[PDB]
Write a protein that binds this DNA or RNA. Sequence first.
RNA 1: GUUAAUUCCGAUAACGAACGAGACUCUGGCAUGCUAACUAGUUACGCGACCCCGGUCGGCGUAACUUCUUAGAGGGACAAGUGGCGUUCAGCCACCCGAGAUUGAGCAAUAACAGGUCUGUGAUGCCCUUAGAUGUCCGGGGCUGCACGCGCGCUACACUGACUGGCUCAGCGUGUGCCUACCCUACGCCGGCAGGCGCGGGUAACCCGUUGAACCCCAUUCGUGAUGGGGAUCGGGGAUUGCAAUUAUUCCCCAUGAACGAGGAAUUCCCAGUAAGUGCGGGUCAUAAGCUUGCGUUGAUUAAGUCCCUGCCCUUUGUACACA
Lengths: 141, 142, 185, 100, 57, 66, 62
Amino acid sequence: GVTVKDVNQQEFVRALAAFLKKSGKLKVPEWVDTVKLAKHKELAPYDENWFYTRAASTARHLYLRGGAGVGSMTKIYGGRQRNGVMPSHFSRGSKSVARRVLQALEGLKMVEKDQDGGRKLTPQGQRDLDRIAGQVAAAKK
Amino acid sequence: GPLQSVQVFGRKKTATAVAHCKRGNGLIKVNGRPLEMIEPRTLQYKLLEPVLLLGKERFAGVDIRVRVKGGGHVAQIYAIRQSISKALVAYYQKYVDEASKKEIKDILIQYDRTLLVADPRRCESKKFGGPGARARYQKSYR
Amino acid sequence: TPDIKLFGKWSTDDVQINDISLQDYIAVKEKYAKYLPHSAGRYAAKRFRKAQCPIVERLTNSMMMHGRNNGKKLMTVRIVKHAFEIIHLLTGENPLQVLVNAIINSGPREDSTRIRRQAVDVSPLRRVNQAIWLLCTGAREAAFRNIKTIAECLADELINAAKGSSNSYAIKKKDELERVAKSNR
Amino acid sequence: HRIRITLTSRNVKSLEKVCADLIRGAKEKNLKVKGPVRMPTKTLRITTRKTPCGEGSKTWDRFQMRIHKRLIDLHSPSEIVKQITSISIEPGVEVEVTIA
Amino acid sequence: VRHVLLRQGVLGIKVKIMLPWDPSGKIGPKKPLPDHVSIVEPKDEILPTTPISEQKG
Amino acid sequence: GRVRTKTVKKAARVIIEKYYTRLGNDFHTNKRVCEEIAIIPSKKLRNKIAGYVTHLMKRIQRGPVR
Amino acid sequence: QPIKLARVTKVLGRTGSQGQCTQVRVEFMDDTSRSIIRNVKGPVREGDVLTLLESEREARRL
RNA sequence: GUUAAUUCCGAUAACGAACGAGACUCUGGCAUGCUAACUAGUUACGCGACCCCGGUCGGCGUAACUUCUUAGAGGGACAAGUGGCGUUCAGCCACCCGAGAUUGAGCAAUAACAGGUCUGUGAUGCCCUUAGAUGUCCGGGGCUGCACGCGCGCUACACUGACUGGCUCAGCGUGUGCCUACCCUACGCCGGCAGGCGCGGGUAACCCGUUGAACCCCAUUCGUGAUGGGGAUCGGGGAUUGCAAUUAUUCCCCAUGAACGAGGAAUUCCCAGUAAGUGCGGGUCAUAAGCUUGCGUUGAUUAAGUCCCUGCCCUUUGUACACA
Ligand SMILES: [Mg+2]
Ligand SMILES: [Mg+2]
Ligand SMILES: [Mg+2]
Ligand SMILES: [Mg+2]
Ligand SMILES: [Mg+2]
Ligand SMILES: [Mg+2]
Ligand SMILES: [Mg+2]
Ligand SMILES: [Mg+2]
Ligand SMILES: [Mg+2]
Ligand SMILES: [Mg+2]
């Protein structure tokens, strides 16, 4: 068939977010609705289900490369730290939000903790990712 | 039977892209994904340029796999742009006749020198007493 | 399409350059038109290698100005592409032909200089460069502090320069420089 | 059996002469030898002011120290390695002999 | 560059000595000067106008 | 300014004066010939001397040299 | 005062105060026998056409 | 006459010379060729995972090799070939072949300033002090004080922009110390964050690290309103460093929401991977980048000229100047 690399990723993360909407058992934390996702961000996100979209993005990043822990997730979710009157720099994201994403993906079997540190992606998660890759391929065809 | 493996590098300012041609079907992919999804998408026809110039008949028998490291976005795009064309020219030089290789080389040269010859321009070193290479800080009289 | 080149969805051919003075210095026909106005570089090496640069690439390069926009060439490629779309959806002609006519109309045939100022007729390459600078300056002045986007402003400036209805800032500055040169000669 | 010689030096042609001499010694004493593996060199960079005091034009020195490190893997016992490395060493090259 | 402490003040001495070139390298440096192009003299040869042979062995 | 210096020109005149029979018109031949006969420390100076040797040999083939 | 085209046949030299005007010999492509000398701003190579608004003027040769 | 050059050709009461420039060293390219490699890999296989024979894997192991990795010897470019200009000499322009047909820095002559440095030195003359010390040690304050002006820089004045998500690429580098008490940090839990708690790796192509940096790309929210631009000022709280933060050391959260609508006279820097936008390393560092020094990404406008201004270098001319 196809893989996720033949699939356009921008609608693919939304499709896996819709898949998590269909599943609905990720056991979201209580402080999801009110928290700001980073020290360098300013506002809360405009979308009400940013947790599912970021878990979709976490799933496809762990599919592309495994063994990515909390520091690597803050590295991929870092950005500009607008210091106001001072020049901007790079700032990593929040640790606990990606920690809860990995706890949800360890709760329902999409990732697994690997030796020598980090999270790898399980063959069940690879199965679901290639199924939704075929879904987005059949949608765009 | 015999492996027609051709490994050809292509260089921008810092980005290096090594294309790999074999005997196979007409598929071209870079870092495990084809040319249709390489962001930014404004340089999609720039990636399609050797296919549009040479037709699908030349690329039908050649499969190209490219490993890329270094540079930026436009640097990697122009690196794979140069590398797949140089890899096809080296493949058609080694395994088929030199006349079609010379014709394809003429077609590439009459379009752009960047498709074959790499640009030797690299970043000039910053000097002391300036924010950049040639520019100096603002001299203050009085 | 291996033989004829298609600028996106636009044809290289059917582009009539009216002014024979601007025939060589407008590099748009049969050799210099490509798929995108983006390129590698090297055009600023020799003196008249700038004439061999295509005019859509020259507009793409001259659009990025004023600090915050320097070095966004993919972004101004997007601007020029949507501007060509708006030019087609308003006029109903070739956007390349509209831009060539805009260069021919907006390019000032004479200027005045210090040899008290005396008027002299300018070089055609300098005239092309002056037209590209003036229409870009008019488009940026129309887009600054305005609801109307940069693509719509650049399309309106090129269409007004191709029409010559004295509503464009480039046409106005061209007529002003031509009137000053007619006065001090 | 696998003994690793690490050759660190500041000068270039002297280090090349030392590693070539070790290659010729291994070839004369008939043992399996790997090629001289180059490491990426290190450029110790110091940027100070030329003026001892603070009053002058803004000039800056660039003190560079280039260091180089090659390595040679030998398939030989320890006495052969000691006998080879005891002979013909020059002060520019520091030798680190790892038994394992 | 050296110092000397006299009674009235302190004097500095700068001695710069250019070493001559040698093939051995004991009295000076081994590398010759970048401007000195050492051109050797050609040997005196006599061109033979008569073809002869030197057959031996 | 690609102007040859006196250390190039006088040494080239000495080479052509002593070894006129060996030198020729081809640059890549008489460059190696000048490398063999003369002790030249650097490749750039060797190329300058070889180029001025080729130019003086062109002057000799055209006419008499002062 | 009609508009006349003129092809550059020879550039003479740099003129102007700051050195910004090329002294240019132009042959008219309408009347091929008549030719004049004018100062021209901008980069000028041999063999291109200027669109002169009047042909009656002439620059002073220095 | 020519050159970036007192660089050469040629004349010649000059000849023979010397420093400088040039030459040289490093850096950047080009070598499908040589040497190399379990502290870089490549492509083939053997498996493993997933999708409908084929595709992906920085998931694992090994089979030749070095194209990508690194660093050594070499080579390559010289106005050499062509067409013109030129005393047909010195040299100049364009073109073919070609990775280059001016890449950048270091070094840098004679003579001087009464240029800066005694607050770099246990480099130092002379003068002052030397026990109620200008020596040395400790506590606190100051070097931050604010009617004012100047300078180097940062933030911006937005719609070519801001916010919120998703995609996605770097290279210079640095890292556990003689005294020295102070390293880079992976990963798992706690917390929204600043951070804290435990096992590990690394004296370095081994680990941080495939350094998942930003600009940019894609998709919503905004609608020309001092607005979701801009974040100055100020209140409340929570963490780290240190013996000690008050005159808030820094960082994080909420809130307060000023001028500024592209800037007068005047002035700075620059022409190719250059300016500019943009972020990342080193120094200062216990805590620490609005500076500086390097590096990387995106990447142009215009120019192949001139003495108009500012100045410099030769020749002639005049001088009542020679601290000129
Ligand atoms: Mg980011
Ligand atoms: Mg607008
Ligand atoms: Mg003094
Ligand atoms: Mg003084
Ligand atoms: Mg005290
Ligand atoms: Mg102070
Ligand atoms: Mg507001
Ligand atoms: Mg804001
Ligand atoms: Mg400072
Ligand atoms: Mg008088």
